[PDB]
Each structure stands twice: as C-alpha cells, then as structure tokens.
C-alpha cells in the first residue's frame, strides 16, 4: 500500500514510519515544509503508526537527537517515538478491511490529517492548538503536549488494570480533538476502509 507523508507546517518535521521492531520503508525522513515521501507498507501490517518529530539533528549517518519524537536517537526509525507524538495509526487488510485511527495517548506534538486517497471510507484529523492550551502540568519542555501517563504514571492514567475511565486530562484531549483517541479505553473512534487501500498523512493541514 502506498501512503504519501506531507509537510503542510511551515516548520520542517523529520517523519517516521515504523510497526514497532522494524522500520515501515527508510523508516524516517526530514521533510521541509511542503515537501511529499511517499511510502510502501505491506499489506497486513499491523499495528502501524506515522508522526512527526521535531527540532531533530541528525549526523552523516544518521545517528542523533529530537525534542519530540525521537525513535533512539535514529534518522531511520526502527522502533517507536518518545511522547509527546500525536500518532497516526493502521492496520491494514484484516481479514479485508484496513482500520485506521488518530490517537493522543502519547501525547500531541503536530496536528494532522490522516485521510484515504482511495473511495469508501472518511478520514480522521486533528488539528486544533493543543500546544497553545495545554494544561501547564502536561506541558513539555522540549515540546509538545504530553499525555498524563507519561507525566504521571498511575495505574487510572495508564490503564493498567485495564479498568479506568476518562480523566481531566483526557477530556482536555478528547475537547478540542474529539476523532482522536484521548486515553487507552475511549469509545473507538477508528475508521474502517476496504483492505488494501491508500492514504495520505497530512501534518498541519489547515496551514
């Protein structure tokens, strides 16, 4: 399947693309604003996810840092990104259809669109200044909007016991992005799609 990965913020990003052990593609790459990547996913892959990392330095080999995002310390993510990481989320062709989310359960960095490129099922966004909001105590330094399980590391933020409800801090998530999960037991807001569709990620759309 192909996405195509675009950088409508005016700030550059260093995208990623990984499943969690393995890159998705070159697994990352610096996008300055306006500039498209387009990828190739494998059908079936699960458990997907696409952000955006910012204010990175990378050396010639492609080893180095970012204040949101980082995936150890690599231009080329293999693994996962520190929060605060608005996410971008897939599945694809299970058992023939490809399920597709936005989530803010690490946190909001970049808004973004998250829409098919092929008929049949509707896209997903959030875009509103979570950063500008924030409640002070989530905020972060380097960055970005954190999610309270990152801050906070309690059993109700984390949903540890698999039993937890929404909280003050999800509900200031779920308030201004109401598409996008806001904590690990909301209602599902994914989205369904024909397996083996296409997609386009969109950072900052309304820019």
């Known amino acids: 399947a192909t996405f195509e990965i675009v950088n409508r913020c005016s700030y550059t990003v260093w995208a990623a693309a ?28 699960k458990g997907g996810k696409i952000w955006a990392r910012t204010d990175c330095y ?18 080329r993510c293999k693994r996962f990104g520190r929060p605060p990481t608005t996410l971008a989320e897939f599945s694809l062709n299970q058992y023939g259809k490809d399920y597709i989310d936005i989530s803010n359960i690490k946190g ?7 829409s098919p490129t092929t008929r049949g099922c509707r896209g997903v ?9 924030c409640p002070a105590k989530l905020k972060a330094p380097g960055g ?9 590391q309690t059993s109700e ?10 909280t003050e801090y999800s509900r200031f998530f779920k ?3 109401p598409d996008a999960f806001s904590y690990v037991l909301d209602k ?16 900052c759309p309304t820019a």
């Open 125 to 133: 966004r959030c875009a509103a200044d979570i950063v500008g909001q």
């Open 144 to 152: 970005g909007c954190n999610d309270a399980c990152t801050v906070f």
């Open 157 to 166: 933020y984390c949903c540890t016991t698999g039993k937890c409800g929404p």
């Open 108 to 114: 909001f960095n970049v808004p973004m669109d998250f």
């Open 58 to 75: 990378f050396d010639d080999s492609g080893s180095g840092i970012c204040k949101t995002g980082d995936c150890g310390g690599l231009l």
């Open 188 to 203: 599902p807001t994914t989205v369904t799609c024909p397996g083996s569709s296409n997609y386009r990620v969109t950072f």
């Open 18 to 45: 990984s499943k969690g052990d393995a890159a998705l593609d070159a697994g990352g790459r610096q996008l300055n604003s306006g500039e498209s990547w387009t990828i190739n996913v494998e059908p079936g892959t």
């Open 175 to 177: 308030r201004l992005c």
